[PDB]
GROMACS .gro file of N, CA, C and O in nm:
model
  160
    1UNK      N    1  -8.718   3.462 -11.548
    1UNK     CA    2  -8.817   3.540 -11.630
    1UNK      C    3  -8.952   3.469 -11.627
    1UNK      O    4  -9.029   3.484 -11.532
    2UNK      N    5  -8.980   3.392 -11.731
    2UNK     CA    6  -9.106   3.320 -11.740
    2UNK      C    7  -9.119   3.221 -11.624
    2UNK      O    8  -9.225   3.210 -11.562
    3UNK      N    9  -9.011   3.149 -11.596
    3UNK     CA   10  -9.011   3.051 -11.489
    3UNK      C   11  -8.995   3.119 -11.353
    3UNK      O   12  -8.999   3.054 -11.249
    4UNK      N   13  -8.975   3.251 -11.356
    4UNK     CA   14  -8.957   3.326 -11.232
    4UNK      C   15  -8.851   3.260 -11.145
    4UNK      O   16  -8.734   3.253 -11.182
    5UNK      N   17  -8.893   3.210 -11.028
    5UNK     CA   18  -8.801   3.143 -10.936
    5UNK      C   19  -8.861   3.011 -10.885
    5UNK      O   20  -8.981   3.005 -10.858
    6UNK      N   21  -8.779   2.905 -10.872
    6UNK     CA   22  -8.828   2.776 -10.824
    6UNK      C   23  -8.764   2.742 -10.690
    6UNK      O   24  -8.811   2.655 -10.618
    7UNK      N   25  -8.656   2.813 -10.658
    7UNK     CA   26  -8.585   2.790 -10.533
    7UNK      C   27  -8.671   2.832 -10.414
    7UNK      O   28  -8.643   2.796 -10.300
    8UNK      N   29  -8.775   2.909 -10.442
    8UNK     CA   30  -8.865   2.955 -10.337
    8UNK      C   31  -8.924   2.837 -10.261
    8UNK      O   32  -8.955   2.848 -10.142
    9UNK      N   33  -8.940   2.724 -10.330
    9UNK     CA   34  -8.997   2.605 -10.267
    9UNK      C   35  -8.903   2.552 -10.159
    9UNK      O   36  -8.946   2.512 -10.051
   10UNK      N   37  -8.773   2.552 -10.189
   10UNK     CA   38  -8.673   2.504 -10.096
   10UNK      C   39  -8.668   2.595  -9.974
   10UNK      O   40  -8.649   2.549  -9.861
   11UNK      N   41  -8.683   2.726  -9.996
   11UNK     CA   42  -8.678   2.822  -9.887
   11UNK      C   43  -8.788   2.794  -9.786
   11UNK      O   44  -8.767   2.799  -9.665
   12UNK      N   45  -8.907   2.763  -9.837
   12UNK     CA   46  -9.020   2.734  -9.750
   12UNK      C   47  -8.994   2.608  -9.668
   12UNK      O   48  -9.029   2.600  -9.550
   13UNK      N   49  -8.933   2.508  -9.732
   13UNK     CA   50  -8.904   2.383  -9.664
   13UNK      C   51  -8.805   2.404  -9.550
   13UNK      O   52  -8.818   2.344  -9.443
   14UNK      N   53  -8.706   2.489  -9.573
   14UNK     CA   54  -8.606   2.517  -9.472
   14UNK      C   55  -8.669   2.582  -9.349
   14UNK      O   56  -8.635   2.548  -9.235
   15UNK      N   57  -8.763   2.673  -9.372
   15UNK     CA   58  -8.831   2.740  -9.262
   15UNK      C   59  -8.912   2.640  -9.180
   15UNK      O   60  -8.918   2.649  -9.058
   16UNK      N   61  -8.972   2.543  -9.249
   16UNK     CA   62  -9.052   2.441  -9.182
   16UNK      C   63  -8.962   2.353  -9.095
   16UNK      O   64  -9.000   2.315  -8.984
   17UNK      N   65  -8.844   2.321  -9.146
   17UNK     CA   66  -8.750   2.238  -9.073
   17UNK      C   67  -8.708   2.305  -8.943
   17UNK      O   68  -8.697   2.240  -8.839
   18UNK      N   69  -8.685   2.435  -8.950
   18UNK     CA   70  -8.643   2.510  -8.831
   18UNK      C   71  -8.751   2.504  -8.724
   18UNK      O   72  -8.722   2.485  -8.606
   19UNK      N   73  -8.876   2.521  -8.766
   19UNK     CA   74  -8.988   2.517  -8.672
   19UNK      C   75  -9.003   2.377  -8.612
   19UNK      O   76  -9.032   2.362  -8.493
   20UNK      N   77  -8.982   2.276  -8.695
   20UNK     CA   78  -8.994   2.138  -8.650
   20UNK      C   79  -8.894   2.109  -8.538
   20UNK      O   80  -8.928   2.049  -8.437
   21UNK      N   81  -8.770   2.154  -8.556
   21UNK     CA   82  -8.667   2.133  -8.457
   21UNK      C   83  -8.707   2.200  -8.325
   21UNK      O   84  -8.691   2.142  -8.218
   22UNK      N   85  -8.758   2.322  -8.334
   22UNK     CA   86  -8.799   2.395  -8.215
   22UNK      C   87  -8.908   2.318  -8.141
   22UNK      O   88  -8.910   2.316  -8.018
   23UNK      N   89  -8.999   2.256  -8.215
   23UNK     CA   90  -9.108   2.182  -8.154
   23UNK      C   91  -9.054   2.068  -8.068
   23UNK      O   92  -9.100   2.045  -7.956
   24UNK      N   93  -8.954   1.997  -8.121
   24UNK     CA   94  -8.893   1.887  -8.047
   24UNK      C   95  -8.820   1.938  -7.924
   24UNK      O   96  -8.821   1.875  -7.818
   25UNK      N   97  -8.755   2.053  -7.938
   25UNK     CA   98  -8.680   2.111  -7.826
   25UNK      C   99  -8.772   2.140  -7.707
   25UNK      O  100  -8.734   2.121  -7.592
   26UNK      N  101  -8.893   2.186  -7.736
   26UNK     CA  102  -8.990   2.216  -7.631
   26UNK      C  103  -9.039   2.088  -7.565
   26UNK      O  104  -9.058   2.081  -7.444
   27UNK      N  105  -9.060   1.985  -7.647
   27UNK     CA  106  -9.108   1.857  -7.596
   27UNK      C  107  -9.003   1.792  -7.505
   27UNK      O  108  -9.037   1.733  -7.402
   28UNK      N  109  -8.877   1.802  -7.544
   28UNK     CA  110  -8.769   1.743  -7.466
   28UNK      C  111  -8.760   1.811  -7.329
   28UNK      O  112  -8.707   1.753  -7.234
   29UNK      N  113  -8.810   1.933  -7.321
   29UNK     CA  114  -8.806   2.008  -7.196
   29UNK      C  115  -8.875   1.929  -7.085
   29UNK      O  116  -8.846   1.947  -6.967
   30UNK      N  117  -8.968   1.843  -7.124
   30UNK     CA  118  -9.042   1.763  -7.027
   30UNK      C  119  -8.945   1.678  -6.944
   30UNK      O  120  -8.962   1.664  -6.823
   31UNK      N  121  -8.845   1.622  -7.011
   31UNK     CA  122  -8.747   1.538  -6.942
   31UNK      C  123  -8.672   1.619  -6.838
   31UNK      O  124  -8.650   1.574  -6.726
   32UNK      N  125  -8.632   1.740  -6.876
   32UNK     CA  126  -8.559   1.827  -6.785
   32UNK      C  127  -8.644   1.862  -6.663
   32UNK      O  128  -8.592   1.876  -6.552
   33UNK      N  129  -8.774   1.876  -6.684
   33UNK     CA  130  -8.866   1.910  -6.575
   33UNK      C  131  -8.866   1.801  -6.469
   33UNK      O  132  -8.902   1.825  -6.354
   34UNK      N  133  -8.827   1.680  -6.508
   34UNK     CA  134  -8.824   1.568  -6.415
   34UNK      C  135  -8.737   1.601  -6.295
   34UNK      O  136  -8.757   1.548  -6.186
   35UNK      N  137  -8.639   1.690  -6.315
   35UNK     CA  138  -8.549   1.729  -6.207
   35UNK      C  139  -8.628   1.778  -6.086
   35UNK      O  140  -8.578   1.777  -5.973
   36UNK      N  141  -8.751   1.821  -6.110
   36UNK     CA  142  -8.836   1.869  -6.001
   36UNK      C  143  -8.871   1.754  -5.907
   36UNK      O  144  -8.896   1.775  -5.788
   37UNK      N  145  -8.871   1.633  -5.961
   37UNK     CA  146  -8.902   1.514  -5.881
   37UNK      C  147  -8.798   1.496  -5.770
   37UNK      O  148  -8.832   1.458  -5.658
   38UNK      N  149  -8.672   1.524  -5.802
   38UNK     CA  150  -8.564   1.510  -5.705
   38UNK      C  151  -8.559   1.632  -5.613
   38UNK      O  152  -8.512   1.624  -5.499
   39UNK      N  153  -8.607   1.745  -5.664
   39UNK     CA  154  -8.609   1.869  -5.587
   39UNK      C  155  -8.708   1.859  -5.471
   39UNK      O  156  -8.686   1.917  -5.365
   40UNK      N  157  -8.818   1.787  -5.494
   40UNK     CA  158  -8.921   1.772  -5.392
   40UNK      C  159  -8.899   1.644  -5.311
   40UNK      O  160  -8.837   1.652  -5.206
   0.00000   0.00000   0.00000
């Protein structure tokens, strides 16, 4: 009611965590690209 909802803060944090993980996944892709070194 007056306090409405406070769990909304946690929800936002969870969304940020998901994005953070994705960012690392893209960066790690660089290592996989190294395979091109052996391909050439």
